[PDB]
């Protein structure tokens, strides 16, 4: 939520099970990621994939 004149590029990164929280962008980009760009709003949604050993994950 901003004005129409603002613009931005965001990196949305999902680090799979077993990985540390990245602490810097070069370690975040190596997982699942999407580049969310304003002025599209087709790029907003990241789909967290199902990556797991077992078939189910405990709530």
């Amino acid at each position: 939520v901003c004005d129409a004149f603002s613009t931005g590029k965001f990196l949305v990164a999902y680090t799979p099970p077993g990985g540390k929280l990245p602490e810097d962008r070069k370690q975040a980009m190596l997982g699942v990621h999407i580049i969310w760009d304003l002025g599209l709003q087709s790029s907003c949604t990241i789909v967290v994939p199902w990556i797991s050993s077992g078939f189910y994950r405990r709530t």
Partner: protein, 303 residues
């Protein structure tokens, strides 16, 4: 009720309407009637199914020996395929670069040497581009080919047991309730020399059990033959080969945390030199990842 979709018929009925509410499971027949051995156990000869898949060469490295290969659980290694897999994400197949024979540090086999063990995939974690794909991926599965080779002369004597134990869970070295440490059960390629048993063995930091007779887990040797194994008798053969598929409940596991195999080598009968003066002989182990798959790529899990 429900049902479902010297010889006694019975009407199949679920009184409670459900599966798993049903009673114990028998062997059905549609019409009247009117098994003794399991070749999957007993460690077949890898010709006892088919030899077309095998002179043994995986991925740029050659073994020349293959009727005496034991095929663990009579199942040939294969990729996860589909329909048995959890994630739809396409795994990575390194193939010939990460599927190749990795020879480890040789170990002197002496008089009084109690045994050795290596955990897998762990032993390979620093080896080549297989050991790189472990860290950069969430999960993975691999079958292995273990080639154990110990050569002495016709004057020497003594036998080894080369066994592959799925999920070999070590016992703590004694006393109180402690989990063996992450570091002592992940030794790397050097494996673990079994130095016990003794009452003087150190107890700290969760060190594993040093007793070879109880398999370090509390179950006798000589029953270790229920696993895939070969017996290297220096009167007969100098080497060993074992082809293990991927054994686990899960399609893919971490490979850093979970070691789904163990390579155990026990001097069943000691090494006696003959008229020769050689008191010790090297044992060499060569492991080949085979049909390995990796998925869930990330930053290297390396610390």
């Amino acid at each position: 009720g429900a049902q479902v979709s010297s010889v006694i018929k019975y009407f199949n009925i679920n009184y409670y309407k459900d599966s798993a509410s049903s009673g114990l499971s028998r062997q059905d027949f549609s019409q009247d009637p009117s098994t003794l051995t399991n070749p999957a156990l007993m460690s077949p000869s890898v010709e006892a199914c088919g030899y077309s898949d095998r002179q043994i060469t995986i991925g740029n490295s050659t073994i020349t020996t293959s009727l005496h290969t034991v095929l663990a659980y009579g199942e040939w290694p294969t990729y996860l395929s589909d329909i048995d897999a959890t994630s739809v994400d396409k795994p990575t197949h390194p193939e010939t670069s990460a599927d190749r024979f990795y020879t480890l540090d040789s170990v002197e086999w002496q008089v009084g040497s109690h045994g050795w063990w290596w955990k897998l995939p762990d032993a390979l974690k620093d080896m080549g581009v297989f050991g790189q794909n472990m860290y950069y991926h969430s999960m993975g599965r691999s079958g292995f080919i273990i080639h154990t080779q110990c050569n002495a002369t016709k004057f020497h004597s003594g036998a080894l047991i080369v066994a592959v134990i799925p999920e070999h869970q070590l016992a703590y070295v004694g006393g109180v309730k402690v989990n063996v440490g992450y570091d002592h059960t992940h030794p790397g390629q050097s494996g673990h020399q079994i130095r016990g048993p003794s009452q003087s063995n150190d107890r700290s930091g969760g060190k594993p059990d040093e007793d070879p007779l109880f398999n370090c887990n509390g179950t006798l040797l000589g029953n270790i033959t229920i696993f895939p194994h070969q017996i290297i008798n220096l009167r007969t053969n100098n080497s060993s080969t074992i082809v293990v598929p991927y054994i686990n409940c899960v399609p893919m596991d971490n490979m850093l945390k979970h070691n789904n195999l163990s390579l155990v080598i026990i001097p069943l009968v000691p090494l006696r030199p003959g008229s020769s003066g050689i008191n010790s002989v090297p044992i060499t182990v060569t492991i080949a990842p085979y049909k390995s798959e990796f998925s869930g790529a990330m930053e290297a899990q390396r610390q």
